[PDB]
C-alpha cells in the first residue's frame, strides 16, 4: 500500500522518453516521494509507494506491450521467396518508409530466405495475422501448365527449329538432340 | 540513499547486454539479411527517439551463432527469433538430383542451360543432373 | 461501466500519432482518470473506465 520501493521496467519496443509527462505526472498525481527517469538504453526506472508504482509500472509494461515487434517463420513449399520479396516489397508502407511523426521504420517489415524458402516477418501480431495470410496467398503451386513447356516436334527437327525461333525470341530456347524436343521458357 | 537509488535505477533502467546461442541449421548471414529488414530494431537515425541506443541484431557464420546487442526484452524476443529460423529443411531441399533414365546428363545440361539462361551440372558417372 | 483498466490497440495501417488530439480529447471528454499514449512502433495504449475506453 504505502510501501516506498524502487522498481524498473524497460519499454523495449519504443524509446521510453514518451512516458516522461505521464509518469512524473503520476508523481504529480498524488502524495509525493516519487522518482521517474529514462535511459536512452530505454529502461524506465521508478521509485515510490506500492499503489502509485502499481499504476506507474502498469503504464510502463503497458507502453511496453502496446508496441510488440516479433518475428514469425513458417516454411514456403512453393513460389520463390525472392519473388515473394519483390511482389511484397511493392507493398511500400509495410514498415518501408522514411515517415517522420509516423515513425513507420518501427512498423512491420517483410523478408524471405531461399535456402529453406521461408517467409520472414518482423513486426506486430496484426502483421503475424495478415502476413501468415500473405504466406498462404502466394504459397500456391503451379497448375499443370508451367512457365516452361517442352514441345515434341513430329515433322520438324529441334536443332534446326531452335535457330528459327531464336529470331522470334531475339525468351530462352534449347533443343535436345536426343528426344528431338524444343525447351523454350 | 534515494539519490544513489535514482542513479543505480537510471543505470539498470536502460540495460544493454549480449546473448550468444548456437544456430545448427539455416545460415547466420540469411538470419542477418531477414532481420536487417527489421529496421528500427536499433537501426535508425531517430533524434529524441535515440534508437541508436536501442537493441541491434547480428550473427557469426564460423560457429553459426546469433548475436544480440541490447535489452532483455530483446533477449526474450530474439531467442524466439533464433528458434523461428533455426528450423532445418523438410526432405525437399534447395538442390535436388534427378536420375535421368533414357536421357544423358551431359547433353541435358546444355538443353536446360537455355531454360536457366539457376545453376546446373551433370555428373558423367551416375549420369545425374544437379540443379539448384 | 466505471471499471478502470488499461487496454491497448495498435493502428498498424497508419501512424497512431493522428489520434492524440482525439483520444486525450476523450480523456478531456468526461470525468478523468484516463491515459492515452503512442509508440513509434505505432501501438496505441489506453488507461480508463470501461465506457470512456
Numbering used by the authors:
A (entry chain H): 97 to 266, 292 to 306
B (entry chain I): 150 to 266, 292 to 306
C (entry chain G): 97 to 149
From the paper:
Pathogenic bacteria commonly employ the Type II Secretion System (T2SS) for the release of protein toxins. The system includes an inner membrane platform of GspC-E-F-L-M, a periplasmic pseudopilus composed of GspG-H-I-J-K and the outer membrane secretion channel GspD, called the secretin. In this study we used cryo-electron microscopy to characterize the structure of the secretins from V. vulnificus and A. hydrophila and in addition determined the crystal structure of EpsS from V. vulnificus.
First, we determined the cryo-EM structure of A. hydrophila ExeD as the paradigm of a secretin that is assembled through the actions of the ExeAB accessory complex. Analyses of top views of class averages revealed that, for both secretins, symmetry is unambiguously pentadecameric (C15 symmetry). The resolutions of the resulting symmetrized maps were estimated to be in the range of 3.4 Å for EpsD and 3.7 Å for ExeD by employing the gold standard FSC criterion. In ExeD, the sequence corresponding to the β-hairpin is absent and the structure is finalized by the β-lip, a common feature seen in both structures. The inner membrane ExeAB complex is both necessary and sufficient for the assembly of ExeD; in accordance with this, the Aeromonads do not have known pilotins. However, sequence comparisons reveal that ExeD does contain a recognizable S-domain including residues that could potentially correspond to helix α-12, a fully solvent-exposed, 8-residue helix that has been reported to bind pilotins in analogous regions in other secretins. In our ExeD sequence, for example, the conserved Ala-Phe motif is absent and is replaced by Lys-Gln, residues whose high polarity would not be able to play the same roles of the two hydrophobic amino acids of the motif. In addition, in our cryo-EM structure of ExeD, the last visible residue in the electron density map is Asp620. In contrast, however, the ExeD-EpsD-S variant, in which the EpsD α11 helix-containing region was also exchanged into ExeD, was both assembled in lower amounts and significantly compromised in function once assembled, suggesting that the interactions between this helix and the neighbouring monomer that are evident in the cryo-EM structure play an important role in both the assembly and the function of the secretin.
